[PDB]
Structure formats: C-alpha cells, structure tokens
Structure 1
Amino acid sequence: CFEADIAIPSGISRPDAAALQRCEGRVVFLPTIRRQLALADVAHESFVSGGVSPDTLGLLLAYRRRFPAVITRVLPTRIVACPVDLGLTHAGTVNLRNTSPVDLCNGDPVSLVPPVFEGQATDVRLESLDLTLRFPVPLPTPLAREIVARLVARGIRDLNPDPDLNVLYYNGARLSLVADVQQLASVNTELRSLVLNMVYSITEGTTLILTLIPRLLALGYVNALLQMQSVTREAAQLIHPEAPMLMRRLPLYEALVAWLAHAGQLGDILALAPAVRVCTFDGAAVVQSGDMAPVIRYP
C-alpha cells in the first residue's frame, strides 16, 4: 500500500470542500512518489508540456508516464491515497467509481482520456484556487482497446469528406458513443494531432515496404519464405496497391529507422495496457455507474 499524502492548499469554499467530497474514490496521476505531495502536482494545469494545453495525445503521453493513485479516504488538509503501483501482486484492495459501462467481475480496467467521453464531465474544477482535476476513465481492456480505434477511424471520415461508426453494442447495453450537441465538434479538434499520428505511420511504412521488398530478395531463406505465408496476400497487395498508387536506397534505409522509431512510440502510446484488476469478493460480479467496486492491485 504505502499511503501517500497530497496537501490541500489554502482557503477553499464549502462547495470547493464539497467538490472534494464528490471525488472519494477517483483516479489521480502524479509525477513522483514523495510521501508528502501537494495539489500542484495533480491538476490538469500541471500537464502543460509545450506551453499550451495538452491534447489526448499529450495526455496519453503522460497517462502512460506518470503514476496512478487512488484516493481511499478524503480529508481536510490532506488527501490519503493508497497508490496502485506500489505493493506486491493481488494485495491492498482499493475502491473505484464506475463510469457508464459495467466493469464486470474481471476485465482489468485501464485509465484513459476524458474526451473520449463527455469532456466537461469529470473535469471537476476547484473554484477558489482555480485549478482543474480531469480524472481519467477506468475502462476494461476489451472495450478500452475498442473505442480508441473508432474515433480515430471517425476522425478519418471527419478529415476529408464526400457506415456510421458509433453504435458499438456492449454485452447487454447499447452504448451511445455520440454525445452530439457540443462534444463531437470538440472531438475532432482535440484528437486533432492524434489522427495524424495514426495516418503518417501508415503512409510511410506501406510506401516504404513497396520499395523495400522489391529492392529486397535480389540485393535466400527469407527470399522464398517472404511470400510463402504471404501467397496471394502480399503479391495480391502488390497487385492492388502498387497499381493504383505511385512507385533510392540511401535515404530509404535512413527512413527505415525513422518510421520504426515512430512505431515504437505509438505502441507505448496506444493499446492502453492494464494496470489494476477488478477481481472482487462476495459481490454481485457486475458494477454499476456510481457504485464502488473492490479493485486489486496487479494484472
């Protein structure tokens, strides 16, 4: 466990005190693991990286970088959180607040960005000292990997326009991804840099491989076994893409590292690895929105 303290700063109001009473059991990110911490390491204003507000890329860099902490008991003058990342595996049971999907008896939930849901939901602001606590969303591993690839696919059809990607049933429920009225116009400008990252790593590599493999095999165990498991797959992709597209070794192999350098960035960026597990005891095995859940430490 090793409970860590976050210091409440000076004079706040009772609704600012009540804002601290509506967050008992949320998820909090922090840079270092000092046993006494302040609120200045917590806020969304502490996420500035280039002088501007971070995007969902700029958050997911930090959301994979800094450290999760879960507030067990709220306090005046302190914030007690028993942090997840310390402790041995499957010990130190902690309690979370669900958001609209289930969080079943297993699932290994993952912290991720707020604007994939309602952006000014869970962006809880302190009014007196004027800071913003944008709490991440704890989604389980199948659906968390599902919704992350859909909006960036929806960003493509929103990029250069001329089915509807947004229905996405759960096991029982119909999950309305679209919060239309004011959010989706802010969606395609807050995942704005991120869509370019999913695109440029595809346009580079595919246009690199179609001048790599024809430059390979004649420049032999990898030669004949290139299309051995790729018979009528890669040569068919050589038949389909190389015809309706365009067609240099020393810049090429220089571009080989650079794309694959960007590839190693995105794997750390994407895919939303599990950090904490739901595997409770004597529950109804099914969590609802706004209800607590016993959550155990390691995947």
Structure 2
Amino acid sequence: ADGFETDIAIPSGISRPDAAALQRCEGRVVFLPTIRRQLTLADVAHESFVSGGVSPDTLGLLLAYRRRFPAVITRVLPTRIVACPLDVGLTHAGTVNLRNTSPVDLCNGDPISLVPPVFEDVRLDSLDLTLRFPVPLPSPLAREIVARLVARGIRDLPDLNVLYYNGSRLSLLALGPVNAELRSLVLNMVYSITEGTTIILTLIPRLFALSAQDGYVNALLQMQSVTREAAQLIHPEGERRLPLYEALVAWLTHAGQLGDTLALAPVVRVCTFDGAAVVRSGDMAPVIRYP
C-alpha cells in the first residue's frame, strides 16, 4: 500500500544487555546519510560524524544535521531497527510516535526543532560504538537556549541558567565539559559579529560618531526609506589598501554559513489527539510534519 520504511540491520555478536538497551532505545530522532531501504549501523553511530582526526563537538553536529536526514525509530526487532525518514516517507502517511529525551514538557501545537545533547548517552561495548540521540525541544526555546549557552562562554573572556516554560523551571547549569565542548560556537560568533561591526563602521564613519540620538536617527530614516537617495548618504568617497570588499565576501560566506545551521528549522509539529494536552518527559508524542 505504498508504505516506506528504512531497515537498519544490526551486525551479529550482540550482548544480552545491549539488546535490552536497544529494546529501551525507543522512538527518537536518528540520522542517516542517504534515504535507502537498507543501511549499515555504522552510519548511525557517533563515529560516523568525525571530520578528522577530531571527534566532533557541538558545532560539527549542527553542520552535519543539515547534511544528514532525520528519521524516527519505529518498532525494534532484534535483527533490524526499522525507522521511517521524516522528510520523505512521513508526508504520505503522517504517523509517528516520538519520545521526549527533553527536560522540557511539550505543549500542543508547538513546532519542534532539535538540538545536540548540550543540555544533557546509549553506549555499546560489544558493538564498539556509541549512540547520541538529539533533544527534540521546541523551536522558540531553541533559538533562546543556543543563544543562552553561547552567552555563557562570552562571559569567560544576572544569571544565565534560568529558563521558564509554561510554569516549569529549568536549570541550564546542571560546567566542566559543556563550557569546553561548546567553545567553537563561541568563537565563530565573535569573529562574525565583530568583523561586521567594523566593516559597517568602516563604510560609514558617523555611526558611532554624531550623534547619540538625533543625527543617528536623522541618518537612519533617510537610509530607511525606499527613495533613490541611497549611495549619496553612505559612502566616504605608498598608502596601502584595506581589503574591504575582499572582506565583505568572506564575511558574507561565514555569516551566511551560520544561517542554515542556527535557524533550527521546524521539522516536527505535535498534534495531540486522544491523549493528554501537555506532553511530559518520557511520553510518546504524536508527530505531524507540514503537508
């Protein structure tokens, strides 16, 4: 009846406790390289995300998830792990149970993006691999939480550990590893932000100059209108060159690169039906993607 399911086969040699952890492993977000009817399990494992040389940090998964294709695990047989890919196989059927690994209880009608477990781990010794499951927390919190955790590391060079959602406290602190694991996300902010705020500053030297309020808003509104006075109110024009326009392109590449990573697109929405209004931690939530 034109159903579509991926089948992730487990290589043989499984220990009896590792099969029970994968029995417990349930409906969660699992990534894969390409959509295919059959797949090796080594693509699913965390070892498949390496760039070097280096086991990837918080930043490199966010690069990877746009290249990977998210799927949600269905029933778990001992021989195969059956999962359906979200971006193709779901749209014809619309039928997924998803379990919270989240600390945050879910409301109805939310859009759901997904974050690597930076907030904070299924490990297999007999298969010699680990499995990281991302955290499906809602997308308005997702733009908040990433901006909170970056702003923590900025202070290392008012308490940031406080978040409330629908009457529930959160504690982002839970220090040692997370501050060092996230450090690459901090540096690409400060490189992109400060390079912008010098080039914009370089083209218009009167921005942080005159005035504090008046001449600034005077220069703002004339720049803000649709009228054809655009270049006449912006530009300034042995002695060496500042490569401004060679730095504009390279900055737009790097700042444009963070666009696809830090948008955290709404892959999943929840429509509660024949169940509770609020989906709590450890519950199976019903899942419907945009048609």
Shared topology, TM-score over 0.5? yes
The 1:158–1:112 alpha-carbon spacing in structure 2 relative to 1, beyond 3 Å, is farther
- Confirm or deny: 8 A CA contact 1:71 1:81 kept in the other structure: yes
The 1:286–1:234 alpha-carbon spacing in structure 2 relative to 1, beyond 3 Å, is farther
Question: Displacement of 1:91 after TM fit?
Answer: 3.8
1:217 is the counterpart of 2:219:
no
The 1:39–1:108 alpha-carbon spacing in structure 2 relative to 1, beyond 3 Å, is farther
Once structures 1 and 2 are overlaid, which stretch shifts more, 225-234 or 24-33? 225-234
Give ranges in structure 1 of 5+ residues lacking alignment. Answer: 243-247
Once structures 1 and 2 are overlaid, which stretch shifts more, 210-219 or 24-33? 210-219
- Confirm or deny: 8 A CA contact 1:13 1:128 kept in the other structure: yes
- Confirm or deny: 8 A CA contact 1:277 1:297 kept in the other structure: yes
Q: Distance in 2 between matches of 1:227 and 1:66?
A: 45
2:168 matched residue in structure 1: 173
The 1:236–1:172 alpha-carbon spacing in structure 2 relative to 1, beyond 3 Å, is farther
1:196 is the counterpart of 2:155:
no
The 1:237–1:282 alpha-carbon spacing in structure 2 relative to 1, beyond 3 Å, is farther
The 1:23–1:240 alpha-carbon spacing in structure 2 relative to 1, beyond 3 Å, is farther
Q: Distance in 1 between matches of 2:108 and 2:232?
A: 40
Q: Deviations over 1:121-176 (max 9, x none)?
A: xx2011201111100000111111110100100110123xxx11111111210111
The 1:140–1:255 alpha-carbon spacing in structure 2 relative to 1, beyond 3 Å, is same
Q: Distance in 2 between matches of 1:137 and 1:93?
A: 20
- Confirm or deny: 8 A CA contact 1:280 1:296 kept in the other structure: no
Give ranges in structure 2 of 5+ residues lacking alignment. Answer: none
Q: Distance in 2 between matches of 1:169 and 1:201?
A: 30
1:130 matched residue in structure 2: 128
Two-structure CA RMSD over aligned residues (Å): 5.0
Q: Deviations over 1:203-233 (max 9, x none)?
A: 1000111111249999999997765549999
- Confirm or deny: 8 A CA contact 1:93 1:297 kept in the other structure: no
- Identity across the alignment (%): 94
- Confirm or deny: 8 A CA contact 2:204 2:235 kept in the other structure: no
Question: Displacement of 1:87 after TM fit?
Answer: 3.8
Question: Displacement of 1:262 after TM fit?
Answer: 0.7
Question: Displacement of 1:76 after TM fit?
Answer: 1.2
Q: Deviations over 1:3-39 (max 9, x none)?
A: 1000111111111001111112111000011210010
- Confirm or deny: 8 A CA contact 2:9 2:80 kept in the other structure: yes
- Confirm or deny: 8 A CA contact 2:223 2:233 kept in the other structure: no
The 1:20–1:204 alpha-carbon spacing in structure 2 relative to 1, beyond 3 Å, is same
Q: Distance in 1 between matches of 2:227 and 2:141?
A: 33
Q: How many residues align?
A: 282
2:140 to 139, 142, 155: 142
- Confirm or deny: 8 A CA contact 1:60 1:269 kept in the other structure: yes
- Confirm or deny: 8 A CA contact 1:68 1:84 kept in the other structure: yes
The 1:34–1:231 alpha-carbon spacing in structure 2 relative to 1, beyond 3 Å, is closer
User: What's the TM-score once normalised by structure 2's chain length?
Assistant: 0.84
1:93 is the counterpart of 2:95:
yes
Question: Displacement of 1:260 after TM fit?
Answer: 0.9
Q: Distance in 1 between matches of 2:281 and 2:137?
A: 12
The 1:101–1:281 alpha-carbon spacing in structure 2 relative to 1, beyond 3 Å, is same
- Confirm or deny: 8 A CA contact 1:109 1:141 kept in the other structure: yes
The 1:47–1:111 alpha-carbon spacing in structure 2 relative to 1, beyond 3 Å, is farther
The 1:73–1:149 alpha-carbon spacing in structure 2 relative to 1, beyond 3 Å, is same
Once structures 1 and 2 are overlaid, which stretch shifts more, 206-215 or 135-144? 206-215
